């Protein structure tokens, strides 16, 4: 259904590609709120009951691409 994570990130992030090596090369950032929204768009694709966990799922694809948070 609703589009994938990789993209929903590259939008609010403002970038197109990732980093050859994540956590080492922080390509983009994402406010906590920004991650709260994405988590809301994927409510159907995710298994989590609370929004808290849904985040941990999304907040798991970013840092693995150089997408720090604030």
Partner RNA sequence: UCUCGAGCCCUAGACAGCCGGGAGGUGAGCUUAGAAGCAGCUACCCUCUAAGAAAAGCGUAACAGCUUACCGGCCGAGGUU
Interface with RNA, residue 6, by CB under 7 A: yes
Nearest Cα to Cα of residue 70 among 24, 13, 32, 22: 32
Q: Which residues make Cβ contacts (< 8 Å) with residue 14, sequence separation at least 6? A: 28
Q: In which residue are the tokens 């604030």 written?
A: 70
Q: Which of residues 31-70 bind RNA (CB under 7 A)?
A: 42, 45-50, 53, 56-61, 63-65
* CB 33 to RNA: min, Å: 18
Q: Point out which residues bind RNA (CB under 7 A).
A: 4-6, 17-24, 42, 45-50, 53, 56-61, 63-65
């Amino acid at each position: 259904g609703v589009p994938p994570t990789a993209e929903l990130i590259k939008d609010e992030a403002g970038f197109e590609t990732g980093s050859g090596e994540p956590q080492e090369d922080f390509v983009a950032d994402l406010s906590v709120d920004q991650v709260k929204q994405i988590a809301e768009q994927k409510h159907p694709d995710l298994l989590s009951y609370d929004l808290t966990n849904a985040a941990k799922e999304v907040v798991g694809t970013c840092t693995s691409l150089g997408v720090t948070i604030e």
